[PDB]
Amino acid sequence: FREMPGGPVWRKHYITYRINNYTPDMNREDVDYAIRKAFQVWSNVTPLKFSKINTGMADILVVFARGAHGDFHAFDGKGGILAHAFGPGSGIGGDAHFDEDEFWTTHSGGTNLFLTAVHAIGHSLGLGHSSDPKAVMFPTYKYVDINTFRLSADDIRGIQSLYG
Ligand SMILES: CCCCCCCCCCCCCC(=O)OC[C@H](COP(=O)(O)OCC[N+](C)(C)C)OC(=O)CCCCCCCCCCCCC
Ligand SMILES: CCCCCCCCCCCCCC(=O)OC[C@H](COP(=O)(O)OCC[N+](C)(C)C)OC(=O)CCCCCCCCCCCCC
Ligand SMILES: CCCCCCCCCCCCCC(=O)OC[C@H](COP(=O)(O)OCC[N+](C)(C)C)OC(=O)CCCCCCCCCCCCC
Ligand SMILES: CCCCCCCCCCCCCC(=O)OC[C@H](COP(=O)(O)OCC[N+](C)(C)C)OC(=O)CCCCCCCCCCCCC
Ligand SMILES: CCCCCCCCCCCCCC(=O)OC[C@H](COP(=O)(O)OCC[N+](C)(C)C)OC(=O)CCCCCCCCCCCCC
Ligand SMILES: CCCCCCCCCCCCCC(=O)OC[C@H](COP(=O)(O)OCC[N+](C)(C)C)OC(=O)CCCCCCCCCCCCC
Ligand SMILES: CCCCCCCCCCCCCC(=O)OC[C@H](COP(=O)(O)OCC[N+](C)(C)C)OC(=O)CCCCCCCCCCCCC
Ligand SMILES: CCCCCCCCCCCCCC(=O)OC[C@H](COP(=O)(O)OCC[N+](C)(C)C)OC(=O)CCCCCCCCCCCCC
Ligand SMILES: CCCCCCCCCCCCCC(=O)OC[C@H](COP(=O)(O)OCC[N+](C)(C)C)OC(=O)CCCCCCCCCCCCC
Ligand SMILES: CCCCCCCCCCCCCC(=O)OC[C@H](COP(=O)(O)OCC[N+](C)(C)C)OC(=O)CCCCCCCCCCCCC
Ligand SMILES: CCCCCCCCCCCCCC(=O)OC[C@H](COP(=O)(O)OCC[N+](C)(C)C)OC(=O)CCCCCCCCCCCCC
Ligand SMILES: CCCCCCCCCCCCCC(=O)OC[C@H](COP(=O)(O)OCC[N+](C)(C)C)OC(=O)CCCCCCCCCCCCC
Ligand SMILES: CCCCCCCCCCCCCC(=O)OC[C@H](COP(=O)(O)OCC[N+](C)(C)C)OC(=O)CCCCCCCCCCCCC
Ligand SMILES: [Ca+2]
Ligand SMILES: [Ca+2]
Ligand SMILES: [Ca+2]
Ligand SMILES: [Zn+2]
Numbered sequence: 001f002r003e004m005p006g007g008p009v010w011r012k013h014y015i016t017y018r019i020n021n022y023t024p025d026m027n028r029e030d031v032d033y034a035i036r037k038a039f040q041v042w043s044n045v046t047p048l049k050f051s052k053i054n055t056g057m058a059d060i061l062v063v064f065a066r067g068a069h070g071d072f073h074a075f076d077g078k079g080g081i082l083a084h085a086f087g088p089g090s091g092i093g094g095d096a097h098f099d100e101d102e103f104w105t106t107h108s109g110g111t112n113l114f115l116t117a118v119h120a121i122g123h124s125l126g127l128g129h130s131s132d133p134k135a136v137m138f139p140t141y142k143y144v145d146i147n148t149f150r151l152s153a154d155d156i157r158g159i160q161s162l163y164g
């Protein structure tokens with residue numbers, strides 16, 4: 001299983017997202033592009049349609065935080081847990097969160113924003129985590145790139161339980 005109890009279906013077909021602030025660890029356009037793609041590779045395996053806004057009410061917020069935000073003032077550090085997003089059902093939740101203490105890249109010698117971003121996009125849509133060691137929605141991080149990315153069966157089949 002991967003799905004969260006409490007009311008996990010968004011009910012919407014059209015998701016609009018808002019990048020609330022950008023890490024300076026890599027270029028804002030490169031962050032935009034990767035976050036673009038990282039919604040869209042989900043869009044391939046879901047009915048949902050994703051559209052950025054710079055201003056207004058977002059479904060999925062994309063937030064970088066370290067320190068004061070409202071979301072654990074001290075936490076983990078450089079490495080460890082890179083994103084810890086939450087999904088709806090318990091009253092609060094459905095946004096993608098990224099610990100700014102990482103050195104965030106899209107490049108081989110830093111923390112890849114992308115595979116973590118796709119898992120954060122998926123947990124926001126109402127899942128929790130996958131158990132299946134090959135899934136993207138799995139918790140552990142190893143390096144894959146934008147070209148060499150795939151979603152796995154449990155990723156696909158978990159969200160089509162909700163949106164299929
Ligand atoms: C041909 C045969 C090939 C065999 C290749 C086998 C596979 C090798 C994989 C190589 C890549 C390793 C990647 C790796 O796991 O990095 C681990 C971490 C960095 O990941 P990162 O998440 O930064 O760890 C963060 C946590 N931190 C700050 C507490 C360390 O960093 C560490 O855990 C620290 C590791 C010890 C570093 C010690 C460096 C020198 C320290 C000074 C020693 C002084 C002695 C006098
Ligand atoms: C006598 C010379 C003959 C000719 C030799 C040519 C050798 C190959 C040179 C090729 C150079 C290719 C172009 C190049 O400079 O790429 C460099 C990359 C960095 O790419 P990237 O960081 O994206 O560039 C960043 C630029 N920035 C800051 C504006 C965003 O990468 C780096 O800068 C990092 C280099 C790190 C290498 C680490 C090696 C690990 C060895 C581990 C062994 C363990 C033994 C215990
Ligand atoms: C024991 C250890 C076990 C490890 C198991 C694996 C663990 C997971 C993988 C470890 C990390 C692998 C990282 C990796 O994929 O590095 C590949 C690099 C760089 O890819 P990457 O840094 O993602 O590219 C970033 C590009 N960006 C910012 C524009 C999005 O690739 C290159 O930079 C290659 C560049 C090739 C340029 C060739 C250009 C054309 C030359 C044509 C020459 C022949 C003509 C006939
Ligand atoms: C063999 C005859 C020559 C054949 C053609 C060779 C062409 C290779 C083109 C290299 C283009 C540069 C790619 C690149 O950025 O590699 C370095 C990455 C990032 O450097 P940078 O992001 O500054 O990170 C540096 C610090 N570090 C290494 C401790 C994490 O640092 C890493 O952590 C990534 C390591 C995995 C991917 C490495 C891709 C280059 C393989 C080169 C193998 C040469 C023989 C050992
Ligand atoms: C006695 C001397 C002083 C002590 C030296 C000790 C040397 C061995 C220490 C091993 C443990 C090091 C812990 C460490 O900091 O890990 C550094 C990173 C891991 O953290 P991080 O950069 O977050 O992982 C990203 C890089 N990735 C995808 C390659 C895993 O991962 C990497 O940096 C791995 C780099 C792999 C190198 C393979 C060869 C790549 C050559 C590329 C050539 C391009 C030239 C332009
Ligand atoms: C095996 C393939 C070898 C390939 C050789 C290719 C030669 C190409 C030279 C021309 C390119 C030079 C690129 C360069 O300056 O790379 C520097 C890197 C990082 O310098 P650094 O200022 O830390 O990078 C700053 C920016 N950052 C953190 C965002 C990446 O430096 C590093 O990332 C570390 C490089 C040395 C790693 C050695 C660690 C283990 C030493 C084990 C020694 C055993 C003694 C027997
Ligand atoms: C050309 C190949 C370059 C690299 C050669 C690497 C050689 C080292 C292989 C080490 C295998 C150790 C055992 C193994 O199956 O670990 C697979 C992991 C986790 O599956 P998982 O059930 O999480 O393992 C659970 C327990 N654990 C972590 C304590 C071992 O999951 C992963 O490690 C994910 C790997 C995703 C693909 C990484 C790159 C290709 C590795 C292919 C190894 C095929 C071995 C049959
Ligand atoms: C065994 C030697 C084969 C040599 C093949 C030649 C390989 C040269 C590859 C060059 C590129 C190396 C890049 C490298 O960074 O690979 C590191 C990976 C982990 O990738 P990744 O998880 O992204 O590292 C990011 C930081 N992390 C760990 C904190 C999350 O590392 C892994 O995922 C684990 C690799 C373990 C390999 C050794 C497996 C156990 C061997 C036991 C039997 C030993 C008999 C001698
Ligand atoms: C001194 C200069 C030379 C140094 C040469 C390189 C040595 C580097 C030492 C550290 C190697 C870490 C490589 C790596 O990225 O592992 C990836 C993951 C675990 O990542 P993670 O859990 O973050 O561990 C990072 C390293 N640590 C513990 C120091 C913080 O794990 C995997 O992806 C799992 C696949 C490999 C599992 C291997 C199982 C090994 C035990 C097998 C015993 C078999 C007996 C029959
Ligand atoms: C340091 C000791 C010497 C080690 C020499 C080799 C060093 C490798 C460092 C680079 C690691 C990434 C290599 C690579 O691209 O792996 C995946 C390839 C095709 O990926 P691809 O579809 O080409 O797009 C690659 C995008 N890129 C470079 C930004 C990651 O292929 C696959 O997707 C198929 C399954 C995985 C195979 C991984 C190994 C590919 C062979 C790389 C060497 C090619 C030499 C002609
Ligand atoms: C006017 C007189 C001139 C006479 C010389 C003419 C030029 C002849 C050679 C031309 C080669 C052109 C290559 C090619 O099609 O380039 C385009 C694409 C790149 O599109 P691009 O968007 O960069 O691909 C994205 C992914 N990436 C970067 C990982 C590949 O790249 C591809 O799609 C990859 C192409 C791979 C081809 C592999 C063919 C086999 C090579 C090894 C054969 C022998 C092995 C023993
Ligand atoms: C140390 C370096 C580490 C990094 C290594 C990166 C490449 C690893 C190769 C692994 C090969 C096996 C898997 C594979 O299909 O990878 C293909 C990659 C990129 O694939 P992909 O992005 O799908 O390319 C699409 C088009 N396709 C499928 C027809 C090639 O193919 C490439 O991107 C090829 C790039 C160089 C192509 C050279 C073609 C030369 C044509 C002219 C030949 C004249 C006679 C020599
Ligand atoms: C050759 C000199 C050293 C070169 C070492 C290069 C080290 C760096 C490797 C870079 C890997 C880059 C990341 C990557 O693209 O991972 C690709 C996959 C990931 O496993 P997965 O994500 O589960 O996708 C599995 C395959 N699929 C598409 C059919 C479902 O992984 C794979 O599918 C690859 C599986 C490779 C199995 C290799 C097992 C050993 C073969 C030994 C045979 C010796 C016979 C004498
Ligand atoms: Ca929200
Ligand atoms: Ca962390
Ligand atoms: Ca940072
Ligand atoms: Zn949080």
Ligand SMILES: [Zn+2]
Pocket residue numbers: 115116119135136137138139140141
């Ligand atoms: Zn994951």
